[PDB]
Amino acid sequence: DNPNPGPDGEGEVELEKDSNVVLTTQRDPSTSIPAPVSVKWSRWTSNDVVDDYATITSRWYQIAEFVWSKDDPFDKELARLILPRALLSSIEANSDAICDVPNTIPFKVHAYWRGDMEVRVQINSNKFQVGQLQATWYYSDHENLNISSKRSVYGFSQMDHALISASASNEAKLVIPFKHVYPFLPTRIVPDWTTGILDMGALNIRVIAPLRMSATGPTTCNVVVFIKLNNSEFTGTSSGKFYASQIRA
C-alpha cells in the first residue's frame, strides 16, 4: 500500500529451480489441475530396468513460441500442441536429431514412458494491452472425431482451464498428470500401434478477448511455452536405430 521503487524496481521474483534451469516470474501463476496425481505403474507390466532420469528429464525446455497480434478474431486457436509429440517435434523442427537435447535422450533408447507434466505458458504483454487467452488441456484429442466442433472457448471453459490476461501479464501453470487408456505411451513404432505414437492429447491455446489497444499502441506480443517431465519412468531399453522421426504436422 506504500510504494517505494528503487534501482531494483520494487518487485518479488518467484523462482522455479528444476535441475539447473531456473524460471522467473514477476506475477502469480494461475494454476489448473485436471486430474489428481497419478501412481507409478512399473509393478504391473514391466520387468525391465525401470528408471527415470530426473537430472535431465525434469528440466525446462521451450516447445513453442508464437506471436499473438491484434489481427486475430474472437474464437481463434493460436496453439495446438500434442505435448509428448510436440517436444520431439519442436526439437526436430529446429533441424537436428533427438540425441542433441538432454531432455529427450531416454526417448531415443527406451520404448515406453509414463510420467506427469508441468507446463508454463508465459506471455510478455504490455500493461496497456487488453486481452485474454485460454490454456485448456484435453486428454486424447485424436480419439474423438467430433472435436472439430468442440474446439472453441465456449466448450473449453466448461472443463477446467487456465486464464491468461494480457493486462496483468500473468502466467499459466498446468499440472498435467498421466491419464490415458493404456498405462504407457510407446515412444516408437511398437506392435499393433502404428499411428498416434506418444500422443496423450492437445494443449490448445485459443483467444477469448482479442488484443485491444490504442491507435499507436504496441501491436503484438509474444507467448512462450515450457514443459517439464517430473514423475517419469522409462521402460523397455531398446536400440536407438529402431526409433523413427515424428510426424511433422
Binding site: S140, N146, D160, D199
Partner: protein, 252 residues
C-alpha cells in the same frame, strides 16, 4: 482458474435446501448413477433374413458400449421415429460430458411375441471396434469368418421364448486397460480399437428355414442401464447441443 470467485456480490438470503427433492418427493436426485441405472433404449431393429440360415448362424450383432450407438435415424422413407424425433437419451447425454469409463453394463433385450424359437446370446470381448462407422446393430447376412457362427468358449445364455421373450443380462468389463474412450470414437491405431466397447454381443435364433418366415420384419428392442461399479473419470465439457422443439413439424 475455472471455479474461482473474485468477488461474490450476494444480495440474497438463505434458501431452504430440499435435499434434491428428498423433502418433497421422498427421494434425492443428487447421485447421477441412480439416474443412469434407469433403463434406456440402446436400439431397435426389424429382423430380415436374406440367405438361408443354419442353426449356428447369428441373427444380428452389435458392439456393447455405454455412450450409445451411431444414432440410427433410419431410412428416408421409413425413419425410426424415436431416434428421429427425440434424438438421444439421458445416459449418452451424460456420457458425452466425460472422457473415460470403467465398469459393467446391463442389457435387457425384448424379442417379438408370436415367435417361439429358443434364442442364444453370446458376448465376445474379442471384436475390436474399427471406427465410429459400423458401430451399430449389424444384420448378419453371410457367414465367411467365425463371426456368424455360435462359438464355443464365450459367455452365452439361452432364453426360452415359450417361457419369456425377454432376456436380462450383465456385460462385464473385460478390457486389459485402465479405461476406455467415452466419445464418438476415431480409430487412429490398432490397439485403440480394443478399448472402445466392452465386447460384442451376438444374438441368434435356433430356427430352421420353415419357422424363420414368421420372424421376418418383427421388431427387436434393446435397452441398457449403466450397472454398478461404473465410474466416469475425466471431466470434459459438453459439445454443441440442439433444441428439440425447434425441430420442424411434419406439416400436411
Amino acid at each position: 482458474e475455472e471455479s474461482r470467485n473474485t468477488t461474490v456480490l450476494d444480495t440474497t438470503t438463505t434458501l431452504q435446501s430440499s435435499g434434491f427433492g428428498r423433502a418433497f418427493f421422498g427421494e434425492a436426485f443428487n447421485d447421477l448413477k441412480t439416474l443412469m441405472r434407469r433403463y434406456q433404449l440402446y436400439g431397435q431393429l426389424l429382423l430380415s433374413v436374406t440367405t438361408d440360415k443354419d442353426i449356428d448362424h447369428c441373427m444380428f450383432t452389435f458392439p456393447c458400449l455405454p455412450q450409445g450407438l451411431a444414432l440410427d435415424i433410419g431410412s428416408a422413407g421409413s425413419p425410426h421415429e424415436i431416434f428421429n424425433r427425440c434424438r438421444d437419451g439421458i445416459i449418452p447425454l451424460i456420457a458425452s460430458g466425460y472422457r473415460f469409463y470403467r465398469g459393467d453394463l446391463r442389457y435387457k433385450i425384448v424379442f417379438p411375441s408370436n415367435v417361439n424359437s429358443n434364442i442364444w446370446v453370446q458376448h465376445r470381448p474379442d471384436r475390436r471396434l474399427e471406427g465410429w462407422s459400423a458401430a451399430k446393430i449389424v444384420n448378419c447376412d453371410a457367414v465367411s469368418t467365425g463371426q456368424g457362427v455360435y462359438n464355443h468358449g464365450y459367455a452365452s445364455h439361452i432364453q426360452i421364448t415359450r417361457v419369456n421373450n425377454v432376456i436380462e443380462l450383465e456385460v462385464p468389463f473385460y478390457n486389459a486397460t485402465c479405461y476406455n474412450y467415452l466419445q464418438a470414437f476415431n480409430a487412429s491405431s490398432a490397439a485403440s480399437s480394443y478399448a472402445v466397447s466392452l465386447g460384442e454381443i451376438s444374438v441368434g435364433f435356433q430356427a430352421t428355414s420353415d419357422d424363420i418366415a414368421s420372424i421376418v420384419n418383427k421388431p427387436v428392442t434393446i435397452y441398457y442401464s449403466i450397472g454398478d461399479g461404473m465410474q466416469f473419470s475425466q471431466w470434459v465439457g459438453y459439445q454443441p447441443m440442439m433444441i428439440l422443439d425447434q425441430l420442424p413439424a411434419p406439416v400436411v
